[PDB]
Amino acid sequence: SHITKDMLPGPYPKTPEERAAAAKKYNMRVEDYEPYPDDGMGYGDYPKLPDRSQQERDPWYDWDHPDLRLNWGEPMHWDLDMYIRNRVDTSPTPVNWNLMCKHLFGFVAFMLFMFWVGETYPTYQPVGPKQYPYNNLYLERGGDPNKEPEPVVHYEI
Amino acid sequence: FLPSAAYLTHQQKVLQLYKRALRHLESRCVHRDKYRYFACLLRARFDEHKNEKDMVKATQLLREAEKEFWHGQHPQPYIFPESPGGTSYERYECYKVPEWCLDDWHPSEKAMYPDYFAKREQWKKLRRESWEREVKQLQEETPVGGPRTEALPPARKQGDLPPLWWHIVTRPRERP
Amino acid sequence: MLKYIIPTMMLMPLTWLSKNSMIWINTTLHSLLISLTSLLLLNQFGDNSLNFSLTFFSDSLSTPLLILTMWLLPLMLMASQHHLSKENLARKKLFISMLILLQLFLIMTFTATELIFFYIMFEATLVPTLIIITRWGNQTERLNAGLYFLFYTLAGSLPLLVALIYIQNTMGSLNFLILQYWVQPMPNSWSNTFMWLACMMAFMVKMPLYGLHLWLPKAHVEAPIAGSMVLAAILLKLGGYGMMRITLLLNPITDFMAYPFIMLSLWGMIMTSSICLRQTDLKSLIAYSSVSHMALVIVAILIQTPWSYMGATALMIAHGLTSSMLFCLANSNYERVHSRTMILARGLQTLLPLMAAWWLLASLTNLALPPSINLIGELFVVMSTFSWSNITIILMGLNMVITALYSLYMLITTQRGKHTHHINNILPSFTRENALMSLHMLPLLLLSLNPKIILGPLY
Amino acid sequence: SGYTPDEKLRLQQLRELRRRWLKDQELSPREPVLPPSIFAFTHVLIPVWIIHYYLKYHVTTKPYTIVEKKPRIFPGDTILETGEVIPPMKEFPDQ
Amino acid sequence: DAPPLTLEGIKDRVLYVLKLYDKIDPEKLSVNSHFMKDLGLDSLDQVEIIMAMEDEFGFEIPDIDAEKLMCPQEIVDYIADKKDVYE
Amino acid sequence: MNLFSSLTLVTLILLTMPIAAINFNTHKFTNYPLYVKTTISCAFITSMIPTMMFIHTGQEMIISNWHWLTIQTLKLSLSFKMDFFSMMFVPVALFVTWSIMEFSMWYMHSDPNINQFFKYLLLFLITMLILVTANNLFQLFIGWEGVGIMSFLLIGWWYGRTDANTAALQAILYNRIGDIGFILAMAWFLINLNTWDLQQIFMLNPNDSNLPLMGLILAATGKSAQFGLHPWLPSAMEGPTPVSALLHSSTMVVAGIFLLIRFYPLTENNKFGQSIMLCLGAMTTLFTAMCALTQNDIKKIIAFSTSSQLGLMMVTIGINQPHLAFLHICTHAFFKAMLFMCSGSIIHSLNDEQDIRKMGGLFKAMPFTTTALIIGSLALTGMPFLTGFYSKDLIIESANTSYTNAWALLMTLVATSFTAIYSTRIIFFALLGQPRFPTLININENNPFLINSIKRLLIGSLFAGFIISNNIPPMTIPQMTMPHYLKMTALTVTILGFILALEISNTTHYLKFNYPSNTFKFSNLLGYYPTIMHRLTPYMNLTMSQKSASSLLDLIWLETILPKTISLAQMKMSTTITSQKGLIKLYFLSFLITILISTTLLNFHE
Amino acid sequence: SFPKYEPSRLASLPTTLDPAEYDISSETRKAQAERLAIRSRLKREYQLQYNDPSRRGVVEDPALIRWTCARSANVYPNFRPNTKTSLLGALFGIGPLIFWYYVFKTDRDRKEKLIQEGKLDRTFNISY
């Protein structure tokens, strides 16, 4: 048995009674409940949350769910399928974001630029070609065993 | 965000920053003697201004301390390898079998362990034996129209055990 | 195969005049007798089919699917107690006889000579599953699920009949052999495209293709377990069977009008494997998994390669087995926690220490672990599609990565790590559930040893 | 500040209860539970016997089966079956 | 993987490492001795004390419990609770 | 002779009886580690025999039996070979894994689920063996994904600790990227060479081979934890310790370059392929060399070390030199098996605290394991001149005497200097510092099994490297003629790296506390690659799965295309047709307009 | 000392430095007190549902069932066709399909005309 009214169709107009019923049904702060708004992407009148929720909330508070970081009565953020720990970990980064991405792409592009600078400038010891016996080693390349040799014998140095 | 109250205090925030900054200096500062030097330098820095009777000066220096701390924190601090974040973090959760179980066993397997099961049966009789009057009278007597706190008082009134105790006492031993 | 048909008619009234507490053993024992009897047929040798007076014949397009259905019937049946146990004896007999009738028309459907008889037995397959899922669907929109089911399958399957009557009165009778022997190509006119579009579109709706696959997931989340397994395995693989039958005629225009369907199935395969990553309602993940695999099947059927048809029937048989099993484990979990939602039922490593091994083995067969026949199917389809266009292998491998990802996420989410310490009602797993596990997977591995049977008529 | 003393009292009753529960969890009545070379080389030799019975007969009767990059005869050595030398490598000079 | 502990031994260890500290005295030192109340030392040194207990016993005690212990008896009780050491 | 084939087949078939034994047991075993010990011991002593026959004669052979699905012009039996690589690799892996069995007897002494652990580990051994014996490429794929799945389960052993099963999820994801590359290789091999069998692919030389080589390089950088797909390796270090030793020392990470070593006749040509080889290997080598500074976990240091070693082997295949890379596999295998086992001895001896901090001083306290770590680290860089000298310095000499790319040689030189300096740092911070770790010390080696295992693997690292390296028929040209500063220069660079790390240490002795200067921050967060990619790409694809798939395009948009339009049209037509009232005058007027539209609008009598 | 650490869609802004915490007013403390009271009363009701010996089944969470029904079948209402919804659906539905369909037009034209000519590697191309 469960009340059909305890689901959630329809957005926030009109402003007194929708916000009253939303703060009652969702167990939230009244004027800190804010809808998405009615953007027409579905979404109902489901609450907006601060989006991180899992690498925060340090586990020494000792709430109920030991891994979901939830305490059984909350608005249960719309991305609970994805914002969990073990899927996406939104810890605060030690430095920045733009500084991180620009240094990483700068280092990788620098390595590719020097790969190309290496590819246009090869290195080699002073070493000539090999001197294969049977005219650059016929009969064990592609074939024609008695048909077309190209005679180039080596002359000594 | 804490079970006792909502605001920590200014002093509690200063103190938590003190513990975190000292732990980060521990992580920065191996060989432990230069650690002792820099740690007492930090203790000197916070006893620069013991005599602070102002409040806006204290909180603005606290915000600048958060600035100067985030400017120089360490990426992998030495977190203790049993705490959350660390290297264990319920490492030995392979055998933290909850204790509502060990009641659905086969009776020959229950014939294997006689006296422990007699003791568990009399604990369970103690559990249902003292639920109704004590816990219902305390949870209708002591709460105001809002409960408004999370730490709960014991059964200090007359007799037996404090309420709401089963899944707090009978937890696994953290070495199973 | 009338020696398969008439014991099914002699099995049904026995259940009617079976006494109390004795319906079960009688039906199970006699369906297992039918399983040995089904195993007798496997004889298809060499050049031709094995025919039988006009109505009946057998190919390896039909023989492993028929063996699959008659092996699936006791598994179906033994999944189908304990969730109608408190209901009436008469309603229980009615349900079991309804499933027996559904099996009878499925055997009729797979052992069909003419495509007209195939159409009759196609919507004969349609009708009982409606009543089953709408009556016993056990949620508030089993109504909507049965209604979407019936209207999509009729409204797609219906002009197929008119095209079949047109092929009837333009080429004489409609034996599969005459249509092997009197066929002639029909060039790129417009009416050829419309007739091909009607036939293939009826089957597209049955597959389901990505344009009309909202058909499926309500009918899987809002069904009992017997109808769930029947619906998924036998109805989708019956649709693919029917497409493999009809596509022998009308070869020269599928190169001109198959390019939208292949594209729609590939991009829908990627989108469906992405959508079954992030949903709730644990049951529905396997539903869109089946959608993704049948999209792969559709691409394999229409690119017209012998490697592709061998891999197609291998993927059909393997996914039928795996999806039926994984539905049965989902029903076991719903027996436990009364939820159907994914994130609630957690733990199940301390608790239930060997039910987890069957979850693991099922998810590894779904993952295409390399002795699973899923991998044999996917591998042959990948070989054929890289011969087909030499660049579409990227969509195949991206499907492969995402497939392993969502299947293994479905494993480790609910069933790796921590009970929520408020469930406290799970009993250790019954011998019946484990019996259904070892009835699913032991024939999968013992078929994986010598799998030369299940490959197609282009052996 | 410290504990409020009611929390101290609640904690003390839970120390008594946790001590008694862990004292329950220990068992040692000294009847705690109550229940109701040649092997090595036969374990090695019986697969050798089975798989060498298998690898002679069926594997030999199947023709294009186990096959070998042949051993490498040398220009000074001879043949076991037919039997003759290959003439040696020629003169050395500047060795 | 078996070091065992006791109550009396671990209490002696905590009282030992409190006695090791410089600017308190072993003169009037016992288990029933409050820190902020009647030993006169600051809360700053009190959290240096809790830091020393963490750095020896190898597990973080929470920041909510770096507030309200103030006496060695509750320290020994809390460490025996986190390590679950009774008979 | 059939003796050779028979003993290779019994070395395969001995790895089955414990698994079916415990599955058919029903009477509980407790000496199951003893059982695994004796069966792997006899497998080793029966696999040393055919390699003795191999170097005694040559005499290479392939076996094949029990064909199935001979469908089209191809066929496939269970078919595996024994040529030089599958000869002189298998006893190495068996010896390593038998020592890991010993160390897992002692280390996992406490968990009462040891039987399922040994089942997983031995099944993983079987599958890696099937990978390193097969010539039918489908069986190679079988071994590939099987060791991927066993790596998944064997990391995710400890349920709970969501970091660990996240690590296992990352591991299986990069194995599937290896899978897409490998099936592209199989697809091209089928469609342009009728089959996937190594004999026929060697028998022809299809010279246009850019597509399959790009697929193979994708598969190898997927499996071998290299640039772009490296971050699953320290995350995979966060499993247990014999887990880490077997899974990343001798198996499962060396299989990625093993296939490129297997395809040496195909890569004898295609210099473009070797350019891609050595450029990617140099990128990995310098990336992990720079990345392994200020990494206070021991296992992550060893992970970056073994990734740099695999970068050296990718450069080694960047030269047309497979057998030096194979010899380096053997030396590296004994090497880091012994090294992980010593590290696990340390970590379990101090209560799994596992970090460089709070571990500082260890010398003169059980000097057996400190001796083990210093033998391992001296064998790193090849202190002059040991088993680790041989493969590594033949690699750098053959790289310097080659038509190289002017950048890869310099990057591998700098990375050999850097592996010298982090070998210095693991020595100096684990052993010689003033002792920093808590009291109640339980530092214990009243233990036979660990001392036997460390004993046997340091004996292996002392001799068996040179023993394998010495008596092999050389399949290359020994260059042997290097100028000044081109033969002793490797030792020169490693010693100057020791000087540089020494002065780092002496500057660390002071009391200064200078700021981090963002190379220090570039090295901590692993070059920011695992952080920013694992925070960005699971945001992109999953947010698009929310927006397009699960919310918009599938459900609500298909419900508005097909059912809504039809249903609302039928609703409107019904509510306009049946919504009539009872004024029959209107119905007779409808009759009238029907008669008039029948007369004058459309002709009906005409 | 620093540019004060901007957040992003991924970079979490921690609760150490907001800096907008420090301008506390009385209504904000009233808000934190009401939040504490709400979590207090919900946990009290949770524990009283949670601590009976006679309870056998699940804890009967209404929040999870609320979220599942609000995510599964309470999406189709509400909905309206905007410019945003229609354009975004037409850009994510048929766009990539017509894109890869054009590239398969190109590759099939190349393959058809190529082996129409005869300059392919099909000296042996058996497994058709």
Distance of CA E5 to the CA centre of its chain: 15
Chains G and D touch (3+ CB pairs under 8 A): no
- The greatest distance separating any two alpha carbons of chain B, rounded to the nearest whole angstrom, comes to 73
Helix axes F322-349, F367-379, angle to 10 degrees: 160
Q: Which residue has the tokens 């031995």?
A: F122
Contact F551 G75 (CB under 8 A): yes
DSSP 8-state secondary structure symbol assigned to residue A111: H
> What is the set of domains in chain E, with CATH numbers?
9-83 (1.10.1200.10)
* H or E segment to which residue F524 belongs: helix F520-524
Find the domain containing B151 and state its range. 97-173
Min Cα distance F524 → chain B (Å) is 7
Task: Go through F224-239 and write b for each residue having 16 or more CB atoms within 10 A of its CB, e for each that does not.
Answer: bbbbbbbbbbbbbbbb
Rounded CA-CA distance F422/F428 in Å is: 9
Helix axes F210-223, F271-291, angle to 10 degrees: 20
E-contacting residues in A 51-70 (Cβ below 8 Å) = 60-61
Helix axes C63-79, C89-110, angle to 10 degrees: 170
Do B59 and B122 fall into the same domain?
A: no
Distance of CA F559 to the CA centre of its chain: 45
Rounded CA-CA distance G91/G100 in Å is: 14
Closest of C412, C410, C402, C407 to residue C274, by C-alpha? C402
* H or E segment to which residue C52 belongs: strand C50-52
Helix, strand, or coil here: D47? helix
In sequence order, what are the residues at sequence separation of 6 or more whose Cβ sits closer than 8 angstroms to the Cβ of residue F150? F120, F123, F124, F127
Min Cα distance G5 → chain A (Å) is 6
C-alpha pair distances (Å), F252 with each of C175, F128, F249 = 55, 7, 8
B-contacting residues in F 360-419 (Cβ below 8 Å) = 360
DSSP 8-state secondary structure symbol assigned to residue A6: G
Do B70 and B101 fall into the same domain?
A: no
Q: Any chain E CB within 8 A of the CB of B26?
A: yes
Phi, psi of G106 (to 5 degrees): -65, -50
Q: Which residue has the tokens 């340390």?
A: F346
Q: D67-69 and C56-58: which strand pairing?
A: unpaired
Long-range pairs of D84-87 with CB within 8 A, sequence gap ≥ 24: none
Rounded CA-CA distance C405/F542 in Å is: 12
Q: Which of B47, B77, B107 is the last residue of a domain?
A: B77
Chains near A with 3+ CB pairs less than 8 A apart are B, C, E, F, G
Amino acid at B134: E
Query: F381: how many CB neighbours lie within 10 A of its CB?
Result: 26
Say whether E22 is catalytic: no
Rounded CA-CA distance E43/E39 in Å is: 11
Q: Which residue has the tokens 């000066």?
A: B57
Rounded CA-CA distance E66/E84 in Å is: 20
DSSP 8-state secondary structure symbol assigned to residue C233: I
Rounded CA-CA distance A118/F525 in Å is: 29
Pick the catalytic residue: E12, E25, E42, E81? E42
Task: Go through F112-130 and write b for each residue having 16 or more CB atoms within 10 A of its CB, e for each that does not.
Answer: eebbebbbbbbbbbbbbbb
**Resolution at which this structure was determined, Å:** 4.2
Do B134 and B104 fall into the same domain?
A: yes
Chain C residue whose CA is closest to B98? C421
Dihedral (CA of F540, F546, F549, F551) sign = negative
Amino acid at A74: E
Beta bridge partners of C57: C51
Do B106 and B167 fall into the same domain?
A: yes
Closest of E71, C347, C298 to residue F160, by C-alpha? C347
Query: B122: how many CB neighbours lie within 10 A of its CB?
Result: 12
Helices H, strands E: what count in chain E? 3, 0
Do B26 and B62 fall into the same domain?
A: yes
Rounded CA-CA distance A135/A112 in Å is: 40
> Which candidate from B90, B95, B98 shows the least CB-CB separation from C419?
B98
Say how many domains are in chain B: 2
Query: G75: how many CB neighbours lie within 10 A of its CB?
Result: 20
Kindly state whether residue B92 falls inside one of the protein's structural domains: no
In sequence order, what are the residues at sequence separation of 6 or more whose Cβ sits closer than 8 angstroms to the Cβ of residue F442? E3, F349, F351
Chains near G with 3+ CB pairs less than 8 A apart are A, B, C, F
Contact F191 C383 (CB under 8 A): yes
The tokens for B134 are: 């004590």
C138: left (phi over 0), alpha (psi -120 to 50) or beta: left
Q: Any chain C CB within 8 A of the CB of A81?
A: yes
Rounded CA-CA distance A110/A116 in Å is: 10
Q: Which residue has the tokens 């392993």?
A: C404
Closest of C367, C288, C385 to residue F179, by C-alpha? C367
Contact D23 E68 (CB under 8 A): no
Count CA atoms within 13 Å of residue F554 on its CB side: 29
Beta bridge partners of F432: F361
B-contacting residues in E 27-46 (Cβ below 8 Å) = 43-44
Beta bridge partners of F82: F61
Helix, strand, or coil here: F420? helix
Q: Which residue has the tokens 């809808």?
A: A35
Is the Cβ–Cβ distance between C181 and C49 less than 8 Å?
no
Q: Which residue has the tokens 């064997």?
A: F154
Min Cα distance E87 → chain D (Å) is 5
Min Cα distance C153 → chain F (Å) is 14
Q: Any chain C CB within 8 A of the CB of A67?
A: yes
**In E1-87, alpha helices (H):** 7-19, 43-57, 72-83
Kindly state whether residue B2 falls inside one of the protein's structural domains: no
Closest of B79, B41, B47, B151 to residue E43, by C-alpha? B47
Residue-level length of chain A: 157
Q: Which residue has the tokens 């030793």?
A: F245
| Neighbour-count burial of C223, counting CB atoms closer than 10 A to its CB (0-12 exposed, 13-18 middle, 19+ buried) | buried
Rounded CA-CA distance D61/C253 in Å is: 51
Q: Any chain A CB within 8 A of the CB of B2?
A: yes
C contact test, residue of G68, G99, G111 with most C CBs within 10 A: G68
DSSP 8-state secondary structure symbol assigned to residue A58: -
Rounded CA-CA distance E29/E39 in Å is: 9
Beta bridge partners of F80: F63, F134
Count CA atoms within 13 Å of residue A135 on its CB side: 8
Kindly state whether residue B85 falls inside one of the protein's structural domains: no
Helix axes C89-110, C2-9, angle to 10 degrees: 170
Rounded CA-CA distance B31/B41 in Å is: 16
What determination technique applies here? cryo-EM
Rounded CA-CA distance C139/A53 in Å is: 33
Task: Go through B32-56 and write b for each residue having 16 or more CB atoms within 10 A of its CB, e for each that does not.
Answer: bebbeebbeeeeeeeeeeeeeeeee
> Which candidate from G50, G103, G104 shows the least CB-CB separation from C422?
G50
Rounded CA-CA distance F132/F252 in Å is: 11
Is the Cβ–Cβ distance between F132 and F177 less than 8 Å?
no
Contact E58 F351 (CB under 8 A): yes
Do B107 and B72 fall into the same domain?
A: no
Laid out side by side, the sheet with D67-69 consists of D67-69, F60-65, F78-82
Is the Cβ–Cβ distance between A60 and A43 less than 8 Å?
no
Kindly state whether residue B87 falls inside one of the protein's structural domains: no
Which residues in chain F are closer than 8 Å to C307, comparing Cβ atoms?
72
Q: Which residue has the tokens 């650690």?
A: B35
Expressed in percent and rounded to 5, the helix, strand and coil fractions of chain D are: 45, 5, 50
Rounded CA-CA distance C270/A147 in Å is: 55
Contact B167 G51 (CB under 8 A): yes
Rounded CA-CA distance B42/B29 in Å is: 13
E contact test, residue of A57, A58, A60, A62 with most E CBs within 10 A: A60
Is the Cβ–Cβ distance between G12 and B122 less than 8 Å?
no
* H or E segment to which residue F36 belongs: helix F32-57
Rounded CA-CA distance C272/C290 in Å is: 9
Do B166 and B101 fall into the same domain?
A: yes
The tokens for G121 are: 């590697």
Rounded CA-CA distance C386/F188 in Å is: 8
| Neighbour-count burial of C404, counting CB atoms closer than 10 A to its CB (0-12 exposed, 13-18 middle, 19+ buried) | buried
Is the Cβ–Cβ distance between C367 and C306 less than 8 Å?
no
How does DSSP assign C313-326, residue by residue? HHHHHHHHHHHHHH
Do B103 and B165 fall into the same domain?
A: yes
The tokens for C366 are: 């779904």
Rounded CA-CA distance C446/F93 in Å is: 31
Count CA atoms within 13 Å of residue F363 on its CB side: 12
Rounded CA-CA distance B52/F448 in Å is: 63
Helix, strand, or coil here: A100? helix
Closest of A77, F551, A55 to residue C279, by C-alpha? F551
Which residues of chain E come before a gap where C and the next N are over 2.5 Å apart?
A: none
Tell me chain B's radius of gyration from C-alpha atoms: 25
- The greatest distance separating any two alpha carbons of chain C, rounded to the nearest whole angstrom, comes to 70
| Neighbour-count burial of D33, counting CB atoms closer than 10 A to its CB (0-12 exposed, 13-18 middle, 19+ buried) | exposed
Closest of C381, C409, C149 to residue C266, by C-alpha? C381
Q: Any chain G CB within 8 A of the CB of C425?
A: yes
Closest of E14, E17, E1, E5 to residue E74, by C-alpha? E14
Which residues in chain G are closer than 8 Å to F191, comparing Cβ atoms?
125, 127
User: What does the domain layout of chain C look like in residue ranges?
Assistant: 1-459
C-alpha pair distances (Å), A48 with each of A32, C23, F62, G63 = 9, 55, 66, 15
Rounded CA-CA distance F590/C206 in Å is: 44
Do B15 and B65 fall into the same domain?
A: yes
A-contacting residues in G 56-115 (Cβ below 8 Å) = 59, 61-67, 69-71, 74-82, 84-85
